Amino acid sequence: QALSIQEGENATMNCSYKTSINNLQWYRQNSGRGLVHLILIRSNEREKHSGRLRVTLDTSKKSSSLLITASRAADTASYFCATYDRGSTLGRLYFGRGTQLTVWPDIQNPDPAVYQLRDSKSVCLFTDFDSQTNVSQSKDVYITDKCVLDMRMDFKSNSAVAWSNKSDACANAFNNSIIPEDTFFP
Amino acid sequence: IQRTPKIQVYSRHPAENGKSNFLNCYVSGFHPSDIEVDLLKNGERIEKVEHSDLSFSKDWSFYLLYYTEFTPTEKDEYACRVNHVTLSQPKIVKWDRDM
Amino acid sequence: ADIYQTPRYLVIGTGKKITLECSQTMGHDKMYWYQQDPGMELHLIHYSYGVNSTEKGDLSESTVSRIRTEHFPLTLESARPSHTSQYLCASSENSGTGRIYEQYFGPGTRLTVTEDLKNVFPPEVAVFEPSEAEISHTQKATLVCLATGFYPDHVELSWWVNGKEVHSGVCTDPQPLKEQPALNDSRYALSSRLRVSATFWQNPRNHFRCQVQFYGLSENDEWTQDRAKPVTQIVSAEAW
Amino acid sequence: FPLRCLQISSFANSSWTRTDGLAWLGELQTHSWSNDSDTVRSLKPWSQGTFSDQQWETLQHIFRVYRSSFTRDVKEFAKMLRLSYPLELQVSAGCEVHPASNNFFHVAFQGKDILSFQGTSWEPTQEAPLWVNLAIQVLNQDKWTRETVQWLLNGTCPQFVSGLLESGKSELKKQVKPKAWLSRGPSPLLLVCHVSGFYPKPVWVKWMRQQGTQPGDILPNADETWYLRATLDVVAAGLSCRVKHSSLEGQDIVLYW
Ligand SMILES: CCCCCCCCCCCCCCCCCCCCCCCCCC(=O)N[C@@H](CO[C@H]1O[C@H](CO)[C@H](O)[C@H](O)[C@H]1O)[C@H](O)[C@H](O)CCCCCCCCCCCCCC
């Protein structure tokens, strides 16, 4: 695997095969969708460009790298490398494991705080921390990990919620993870 | 299956009783490649029998050489037994020293 | 384009006969079926060169048919929990038309096979009002939606402000959480969040709604439990 | 002294397959290719010709990938076409140099020519099933393989053959004297002249008063010499057998009955 970067940063992913290949291609997948072909490089080529991504092929070391410049939330997905071992339709496409890439918001003015809220018709909210902060799963306690924003925008911020039907304090819910020292507590 | 095997038996050197020699069986002109070849001594198959690398001619038909060292004598009789899809019975060709 | 698959989601009982649909209107003679574990390695289980071509791949108990170019249906004779995964359908361009190397995929089918359909529960949906301490501390207001106790984890969540679905300010968990990581067929929880201006929330007129599309049983499924048949449905919670 | 590279691929079914090969320079076998071996085996000290080790290994790698790829492609044609097992394919490829060298690449299915490499692509031979005509369209997509074959026949082969001609020039011009002996065959009394152990292959054998002799086939021996039999059907004295061979520096072998 997993790779986490910030919007605007460049992302590089590694891939390696074993046998002889006619060409190598990279795919990306998103939750609830199928694979989408990104770019194809032949065995007699060393580098290929398209939009913001660039693929490099080292037939000697038998590996390839996928570079994504100016990482953007839209880039968040699973990336797969697949090799094709024929110059005809008798070829076999071989897929690798695939690494999860997540592009987090670049938060210039971070302001970590833990707010509580009642259930209209009992929830703690840890938000406004920078993208390099990781939340950890709790012990019958419920803690979610940093959420992913959706492309389709205006409001951009990190948040992780904790909840419990027990009346037994948000000021101690996220202590399980590595939260900012100056984290605000109302 | 279309081409039956030709079978020829002969010695490396002139037949001399009690004198070491090589017995040869050359099987050619057959197809497909699958074939069973035994060198017989008095009707019983010979063991450590060698053969060349399977090969074929311009007409795609296969040929092969089976051979083994033997010591001929007045009594003992040697022959080549070939089994191939192109034949209902395994064909046996006797080694006729005076032939 | 393109290629189509139904159903997107499916939960079925152990040992039932399943038929996954795949169609393609690109005229591709060559098609493929894949079995995938979420984010994991893809396994070719079937492929086809064209009409009447039905070949087994390097991988399970299933068959395919190719009576027509357009259709390449997959059938699961029986269903074991081992058949819990994603099923992707793909195709490749004909020689002379375009590059033959890439494969075009469908949306895929997310299949869950459970030991007992009594484990299928619709989500409970709750919306939590923005904290007061946040409204004066950041001049903003974040609503939190909680979808809990559902199974399978076949869910689609969205926010609706005054009749319109909103995206900006929305931050949803990538994957549903396991209620109890222990239990094999544990239930799941998913949280989302909609942030807006601290003045937009105070507005008693503005209506907010968290919608959770759930995928479960169909009318075709049998049910004899003393509770509402956990069929496909939308469960919502809201606030003003 | 043309170079003949032979291939024998046997497909009993979809699960059992063997490919074996060997190389002939003229009448001599220079290489053996066992399906039980990763590499092609050199039979002679000069089998590598003039090619360097790095060169020879390059060719070595090409045969590995080719053996593996060839057999899988056959299986896929079997499915696609689709053909019944068992299948048996034979490849004959190589060249021979001249003071303009010529090259060839023929493949036989079930012992019959189906296609050969002609120019820059694959073509069907006159006697070829319609399916072969289809298998060609697929093969001709593989542009790279199409160039490799073109380069192997027109470039690699003529060079490797020139390397062999000089590296093993002495063993190619080597001379081996045959020993001969007479025998009485089965009566039609037919006289038999045996001539074994001669190299190279070319030979002359006739019964002398020249007579109406019936020469048999030139059979091989295990050590790469040849055997021959000349029989004459006569009524049961002054008859002789004459043997003319290059190893015999004008000294024809003569055996009287
Ligand atoms: C002639 C040169 C002699 C040099 C000196 C030799 C000395 C040693 C002699 C050894 C004696 C035994 C020799 C064995 C018999 C002779 C074999 C010689 C033929 C060598 C052919 C080499 C072809 C190289 C191309 C190849 O392997 N293709 C591979 C892989 O290619 C893939 O990978 C490549 C990179 O690795 C590229 O990416 C390519 O695009 C992709 O498709 C591809 O799979 C090709 O199909 C080659 C296999 C079939 C080729 C012949 C087809 C004949 C027709 C068959 C018809 C079947 C019909 C249904 C029953």
Side-chain angles (χ1 to χ4, degrees), chain A residues 2-3 5-17 19-30 32 34-45 47 49-53 55-59 62-70 72-96 98-99 101-102 104-107 110-118 120 122-136 141-150 153-155 158-164 166-171 173-186, chain B residues 1-44 46-47 49-74 76-98, chain C residues 1-40 42-55 57-58 62-84 86-128 130-201 203-204 206-240, chain D residues 1-81 83-183 185-188 190-205 207-210 212-257:
Chain A
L3 181 63
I5 52 66
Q6 284 192 8
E7 207 160 45
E9 296 181 353
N10 294 344
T12 178
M13 283 159 174
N14 308 327
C15 167
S16 67
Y17 55 98
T19 63
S20 72
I21 76 171
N22 182 277
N23 64 88
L24 173 37
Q25 45 196 259
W26 282 84
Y27 286 79
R28 61 166 288 170
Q29 186 185 35
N30 282 124
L35 302 232
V36 176
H37 180 256
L38 298 169
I39 188 168
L40 166 15
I41 188 173
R42 286 178 168 85
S43 60
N44 57 319
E45 296 171 336
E47 184 170 349
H49 302 261
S50 178
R52 287 165 35 249
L53 54 170
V55 185
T56 63
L57 178 62
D58 184 342
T59 50
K62 296 201 176 189
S63 65
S64 178
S65 278
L66 183 60
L67 164 60
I68 310 179
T69 54
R72 309 175 184 185
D75 296 331
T76 296
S78 280
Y79 293 84
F80 300 79
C81 150
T83 55
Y84 196 87
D85 58 20
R86 209 108 315 182
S88 70
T89 56
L90 267 50
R92 191 63 156 268
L93 194 61
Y94 289 91
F95 285 96
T99 61
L101 200 201
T102 172
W104 307 96
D106 186 331
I107 300 175
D111 186 27
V114 180
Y115 310 100
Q116 182 181 359
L117 38 166
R118 308 308 108 87
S120 61
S122 50
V123 160
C124 302
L125 178 61
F126 176 50
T127 178
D128 293 341
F129 55 86
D130 66 322
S131 296
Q132 289 199 345
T133 298
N134 295 329
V135 180
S136 303
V141 36
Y142 301 134
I143 305 177
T144 80
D145 200 327
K146 53 205 300 182
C147 65
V148 176
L149 303 165
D150 59 322
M153 161 44 54
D154 180 78
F155 271 84
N158 297 320
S159 53
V161 304
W163 70 86
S164 186
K166 67 191 64 176
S167 58
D168 188 32
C170 303
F174 297 101
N175 297 19
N176 176 266
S177 306
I178 304 70
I179 79 298
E181 311 167 18
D182 61 336
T183 299
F184 167 80
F185 292 98
Chain B
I1 81 176
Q2 293 176 354
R3 284 174 267 180
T4 186
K6 186 175 183 177
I7 310 174
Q8 286 156 309
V9 187
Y10 50 102
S11 304
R12 176 63 214 292
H13 308 281
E16 175 113 9
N17 296 335
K19 190 172 301 180
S20 184
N21 201 331
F22 273 25
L23 181 64
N24 299 318
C25 183
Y26 184 67
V27 186
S28 61
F30 65 95
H31 214 292
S33 70
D34 286 274
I35 193 173
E36 180 174 326
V37 175
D38 293 282
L39 294 183
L40 302 177
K41 172 178 181 175
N42 296 328
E44 296 188 357
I46 302 177
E47 293 292 294
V49 296
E50 299 294 341
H51 70 68
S52 56
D53 289 330
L54 197 271
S55 185
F56 59 87
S57 309
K58 173 187 258 291
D59 76 343
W60 304 108
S61 61
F62 299 104
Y63 60 83
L64 235 194
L65 177 69
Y66 290 84
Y67 61 91
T68 191
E69 86 97 327
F70 74 137
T71 298
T73 60
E74 294 184 357
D76 300 335
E77 34 200 339
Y78 297 86
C80 190
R81 181 175 57 188
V82 175
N83 199 41
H84 192 257
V85 59
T86 62
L87 50 75
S88 59
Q89 285 186 347
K91 193 160 123 72
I92 108 173
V93 165
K94 354 290 186 177
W95 170 61
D96 214 89
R97 56 209 296 172
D98 292 280
Chain C
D2 207 29
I3 162 179
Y4 326 88
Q5 298 186 226
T6 55
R8 291 294 191 285
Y9 306 91
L10 210 196
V11 63
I12 196 62
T14 275
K16 294 299 182 60
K17 184 188 181 183
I18 291 61
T19 288
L20 305 193
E21 300 300 345
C22 175
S23 291
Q24 164 266 142
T25 63
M26 289 177 292
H28 296 177
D29 301 319
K30 201 133 174 278
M31 300 189 62
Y32 324 76
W33 271 102
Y34 294 91
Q35 185 277 337
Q36 174 189 23
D37 298 20
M40 295 294 67
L42 302 189
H43 305 112
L44 216 224
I45 69 283
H46 295 273
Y47 66 95
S48 176
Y49 289 111
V51 175
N52 280 30
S53 177
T54 294
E55 304 301 344
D58 45 38
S62 64
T63 72
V64 293
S65 81
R66 196 73 185 284
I67 301 175
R68 308 182 58 83
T69 305
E70 291 69 22
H71 308 285
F72 194 41
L74 209 208
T75 289
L76 254 54
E77 316 296 341
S78 299
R80 66 175 75 267
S82 178
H83 288 159
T84 289
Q86 193 170 27
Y87 291 83
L88 301 168
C89 189
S91 67
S92 56
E93 187 54 87
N94 300 328
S95 183
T97 293
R99 200 165 60 190
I100 70 174
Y101 306 112
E102 317 96 299
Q103 284 175 20
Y104 306 77
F105 288 83
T109 292
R110 192 169 183 177
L111 173 66
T112 300
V113 172
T114 179
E115 314 294 355
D116 192 328
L117 297 182
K118 84 207 307 292
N119 304 344
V120 176
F121 291 84
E124 297 198 21
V125 189
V127 181
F128 296 71
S131 176
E132 190 70 11
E134 181 199 16
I135 295 181
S136 63
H137 186 247
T138 62
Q139 187 58 23
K140 293 191 295 296
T142 295
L143 302 66
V144 178
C145 170
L146 252 68
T148 58
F150 63 91
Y151 181 104
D153 62 329
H154 304 181
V155 140
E156 296 180 355
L157 180 164
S158 62
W159 287 90
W160 300 79
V161 172
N162 299 326
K164 308 172 187 177
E165 181 184 8
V166 299
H167 293 290
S168 57
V170 170
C171 196
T172 303
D173 296 330
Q175 293 278 356
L177 300 61
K178 262 193 172 186
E179 296 296 21
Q180 298 152 312
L183 180 60
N184 304 331
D185 294 27
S186 169
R187 295 208 257 178
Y188 293 95
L190 184 74
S191 91
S192 185
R193 289 170 281 293
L194 169 51
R195 200 184 213 184
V196 296
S197 66
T199 64
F200 191 80
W201 166 247
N203 193 343
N206 290 330
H207 176 190
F208 306 76
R209 183 172 64 85
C210 169
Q211 169 179 309
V212 172
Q213 176 69 51
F214 173 72
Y215 300 93
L217 281 50
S218 61
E219 296 180 354
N220 192 26
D221 296 280
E222 253 51 14
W223 190 256
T224 54
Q225 301 297 115
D226 284 348
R227 47 178 278 245
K229 190 178 181 181
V231 293
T232 298
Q233 62 187 276
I234 292 186
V235 181
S236 285
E238 57 191 19
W240 289 87
Chain D
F1 296 79
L3 181 61
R4 274 178 275 259
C5 305
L6 306 190
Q7 174 185 343
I8 302 176
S9 297
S10 180
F11 298 70
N13 28 74
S14 56
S15 184
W16 202 97
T17 287
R18 264 201 81 108
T19 57
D20 296 275
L22 55 173
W24 294 97
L25 186 61
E27 66 183 68
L28 289 184
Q29 187 182 353
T30 60
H31 300 90
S32 189
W33 195 18
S34 177
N35 167 93
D36 293 310
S37 177
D38 302 325
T39 178
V40 176
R41 197 169 76 261
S42 296
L43 298 180
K44 309 293 188 178
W46 46 272
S47 287
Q48 191 168 321
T50 291
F51 282 21
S52 60
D53 290 337
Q54 55 280 53
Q55 282 183 288
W56 179 242
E57 263 305 304
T58 289
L59 234 57
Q60 210 69 247
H61 177 265
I62 288 181
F63 286 108
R64 292 195 200 91
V65 172
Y66 163 77
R67 178 170 64 180
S68 167
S69 306
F70 171 93
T71 75
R72 193 245 264 173
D73 283 9
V74 165
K75 298 174 179 175
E76 294 305 319
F77 275 129
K79 294 164 182 171
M80 179 192 305
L81 252 4
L83 323 176
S84 307
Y85 293 94
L87 313 175
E88 209 183 39
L89 294 111
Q90 301 171 263
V91 176
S92 182
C95 61
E96 68 170 343
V97 176
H98 306 280
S101 73
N102 67 283
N103 51 80
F104 51 89
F105 192 117
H106 292 264
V107 51
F109 180 79
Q110 307 304 30
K112 306 176 181 183
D113 255 271
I114 60 174
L115 69 85
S116 62
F117 196 85
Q118 215 65 24
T120 70
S121 70
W122 302 101
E123 301 281 22
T125 61
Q126 70 181 22
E127 176 193 288
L130 191 158
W131 64 259
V132 174
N133 293 68
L134 301 178
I136 272 168
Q137 297 174 356
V138 171
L139 287 175
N140 283 338
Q141 300 165 12
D142 196 354
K143 317 303 177 185
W144 180 99
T145 292
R146 215 134 64 80
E147 293 183 4
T148 296
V149 167
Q150 188 173 351
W151 167 248
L152 284 182
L153 294 182
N154 194 253
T156 299
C157 188
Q159 295 189 359
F160 184 78
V161 173
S162 295
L164 298 179
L165 286 184
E166 55 178 333
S167 64
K169 190 187 187 308
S170 59
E171 190 189 349
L172 289 183
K173 315 305 180 300
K174 182 181 179 182
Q175 298 287 340
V176 194
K177 300 186 180 186
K179 68 208 309 177
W181 67 96
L182 301 180
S183 74
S187 47
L190 64 78
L191 289 50
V192 187
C193 184
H194 307 257
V195 182
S196 172
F198 60 94
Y199 176 98
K201 195 176 184 179
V203 65
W204 188 88
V205 181
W207 284 90
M208 245 50 197
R209 55 277 184 285
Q210 218 110 340
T213 307
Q214 183 60 47
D217 301 320
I218 298 172
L219 298 351
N221 288 317
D223 58 18
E224 285 174 307
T225 64
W226 306 96
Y227 170 99
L228 179 62
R229 196 191 68 158
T231 69
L232 187 65
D233 179 14
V234 179
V235 299
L239 285 177
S240 182
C241 183
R242 184 74 78 100
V243 167
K244 281 177 163 56
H245 185 261
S246 63
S247 71
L248 304 186
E249 30 214 330
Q251 295 221 354
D252 298 17
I253 281 184
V254 178
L255 298 172
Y256 287 86
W257 177 270

